[PDB]
Symmetry: C2
Subunit: 579 residues, 2 copies
Amino acid sequence: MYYSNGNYEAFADPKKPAGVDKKSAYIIGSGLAGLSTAVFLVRDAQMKGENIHILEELPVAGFVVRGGREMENHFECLWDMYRSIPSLEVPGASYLDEYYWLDKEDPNSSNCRLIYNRGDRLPSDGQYGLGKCANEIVKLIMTPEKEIEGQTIEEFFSDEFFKTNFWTYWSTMFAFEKWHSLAEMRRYAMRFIHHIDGLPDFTALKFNKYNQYESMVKPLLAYLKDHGVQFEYDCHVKNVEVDHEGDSKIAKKIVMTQNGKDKEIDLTHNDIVFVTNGSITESSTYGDQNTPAPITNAKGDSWKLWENLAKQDPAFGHPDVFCENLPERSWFVSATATLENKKLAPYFERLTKRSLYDGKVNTGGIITIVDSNWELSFTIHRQPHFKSQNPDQIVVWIYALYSDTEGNYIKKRIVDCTGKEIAEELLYHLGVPESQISELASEENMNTVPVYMPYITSYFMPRRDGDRPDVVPEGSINLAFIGNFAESPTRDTVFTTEYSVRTAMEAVYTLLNVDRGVPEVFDSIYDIRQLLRAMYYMSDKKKLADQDMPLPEKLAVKTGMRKIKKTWVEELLKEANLV
Amino acid sequence: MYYSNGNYEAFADPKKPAGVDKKSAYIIGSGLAGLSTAVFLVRDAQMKGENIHILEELPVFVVRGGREMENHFECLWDMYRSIPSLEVPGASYLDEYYWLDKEDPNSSNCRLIYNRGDRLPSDGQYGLGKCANEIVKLIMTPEKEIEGQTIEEFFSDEFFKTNFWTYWSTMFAFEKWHSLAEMRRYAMRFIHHIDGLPDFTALKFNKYNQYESMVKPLLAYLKDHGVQFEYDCHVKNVEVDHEGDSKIAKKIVMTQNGKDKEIDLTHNDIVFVTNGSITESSTYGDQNTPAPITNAKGDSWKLWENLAKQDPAFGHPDVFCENLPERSWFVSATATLENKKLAPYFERLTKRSLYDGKVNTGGIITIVDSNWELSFTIHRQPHFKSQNPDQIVVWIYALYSDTEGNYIKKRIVDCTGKEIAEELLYHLGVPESQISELASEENMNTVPVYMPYITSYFMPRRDGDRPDVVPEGSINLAFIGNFAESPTRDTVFTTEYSVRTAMEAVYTLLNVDRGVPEVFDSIYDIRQLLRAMYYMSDKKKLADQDMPLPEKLAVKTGMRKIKKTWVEELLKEANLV
Ligand SMILES: [K+]
Ligand SMILES: [K+]
Ligand code: NA
């Protein structure tokens, strides 16, 4: 397998690799990584549809389970796949095309990113406000990853840094807690450096037409049905068994249980197994307008499988780190709130300076209430978010970064609230008069459903070498792990769909010997223009000479700019507006 | 119009732009730029095919010859993925090219020879020494600061004796009196290939000659979409108006079939002009006849002079087509081997059989002690589908045309095809007694061609000498080709440049809402800069590379400061530490 960039490798179709007609696929998990694996198998590997079996775990507005995240232009792998996938809303076009045109017609941006004081836009919204703390960020990048193994963000950054607007933007938009992986933070900093100009106003973000299920899953599924892939419902997989022959490792056996009966499968090498290991959606619970949701550390199929696998060889990772010992402080709860009327529309609309009812982008991503004890953020997508919605309905997404804090108005934790209470704390923070809050929040006017999720923060748990198992373990023969808990050999970032697609690609290309480049992670961090541009925007648009840095550094910079006068480097600096 | 990079914009299909049915296309020139312009109009602008008219200059073999490419011809690959192959049914041309490149990868086992068949001992070395710094000095020098400047005005005499200059000049056809700015552009553009210049591993080739592999699938695609080719067309001028600051094309005055003709045009008729030519006025010779020397300006150049007359922004053809030195490259010849008598000489050079259908010379071989700066190449065979199984076609070029050969005491421009072949056979180490018979028609047939403007793209230039692809205020007129000025830093004497001008022109004029890929950004990639300093110096660690003393001091100080950092990791990756 090899990595590449540029149009030549992107537009190129791979040759059918040797002996793929004698081979089959077992995809355990209908998670994005698994399905992606299947799509690549059909398209690039040219394995046959009737030979792909995706083993699902389930039998066949306000839907948290269907909700999904944003993307950006530089999800290279994901855009490769989706340019191969037929759209459902605009027949005859690829999903990528639908997405691309929608983004052009209804471009994402936020008119209000940070609020406080019960509904006032934060005066410094739009500013990073880093000061010398910017240098800290640079230092993090200058620090090799192996050197920060297991280390935490809180362990690296100053208190002053954590008071910056930059940290409010970063933590809330990416769900980075202070006790999370410093190495992963650093990866985000390098990876999305090209969007430093668009994080505060979210112009960097792009969104699907609808919730993740309608926009991202249904077109894939239709594509697969058209290609005769095999769907298995109500299946519950229990383990996979592996042998060691010299330095080689082979998957010999899979044990499991389906429908109402137990089953087993010995394996040919020509049967290929991909495990979408781990989950952040498992054990999700529901409440409603008048009911809350319950605390857990319960495990499940993915986690258990992964422990057995770790038992068999060290190379399968050390899983507990992701599903065990999550703080009460952790983000756990996410809720949906459906507005049945236009009674609460003005509060949001006053924030966004846009109408909720034109079908266009609204909050353009999350709005964070900075003086909220829960660190409450909320977002209203382009509507309808679900096609079921009636013309007057609006759907609002609510999340708390802190789950160990008493709210400002509802003195209970987010975890102890019904939908009505979360709605109530939000209404208080929107500047709804407290006398009106009870009638405005109730079902006649507002219908709110919460969900609790033990594992939503699991991806970002700090890690150590060998903690995450290589997508192809050294010596593996028909077994691969795919998804956001697998270790791609790239510097790519988890809690992204792009990572899932990348793992599927690397796994399929490696195992099935597909002779085509896998795109490297987009190389913005190595593009000097991007480095300069980032220094410009991170500093809130200050010329290099005016930026906050220690005095010897400032002098050194003055000397450097003196030396490079009338040079290509000076031109580069001019281009970045650093002089 | 906007520039972009990455897969998102690459894989995205543009919307049909507004009002593309009230507009028409007249493409002057059926060369790669024109055909590409037509392809983008059909595919992206979605102009209807019968509304596209390509005015060809020709009625219904060196001239067929074409250059190599590389992976980062971003626009060209964007085009050829849409074009069906003819050799590989059901696949795109890009697919054919890609698979071919994979099964028969290009490389050279012998780049430089001398002493009549001996491989140069330093083959594979750039051998730059301290001269390497000059190259850096050039990169670090803003283009505006070297406007109009010449290559020999910048570089030390020691630099010109380096192997690097031999490789560079012979592979790219850079003469010393050529554009320094263009050289700088080549250095930045192809920096990602510094690891693969001596052995030509950077190069990729079509299965066949340019007409067969590059042009024919295009023609089939275009006719298939019902584009209209109008033949025997000789455009003499295009008349344009000045309204306020605006420029508009009114009329094309042409002669077709010996008759003066005209087409007056609305603002909505769109005309693409391939200004200038490097192939025009080419003359032919054969085994027993030299090609006639000429200074004639054909249709293309006259058209460009007239256009320059009409508007100041329309460029200055005279800087490209006038006063070219006699030393300039002029002659290229094809030598068809009718049998296997001379085969061992080429085979001893390439360490490969000439008859396995696979790559041979893998690009040009330069004979360093030849007075002509004689280079020759043998592509993967057959190069023309016409060839019979015993035939092998050899391409011969001389960078110097004002010098007497070593065996044939004439300048190449005064030689028969047989004489050129004789000089080549001499340099291959054929015994002097055998040379006349071996060069003779029974064994070799060599056809020379004299091309007056083959070096014109590289003539030194100044801002405005080349007209902007869409000059400011134009509403229906665009210039395309390797004489047009793309607003990018892209490199001419490349097919990729032709494709780029076509894409930029169509996207700008017809308001196509999709990114045009920027020139591939290897020059801005730190991994590539580091890699370049590594390979350029013939694999020396940064401290060991030959450097002036203050500069060296700066480097030791720098390396000291960045010790144990991510930057040190990058330097490690580049093998600079
Ligand atoms: K790029
Ligand atoms: K060969
Ligand atoms: Na769709």
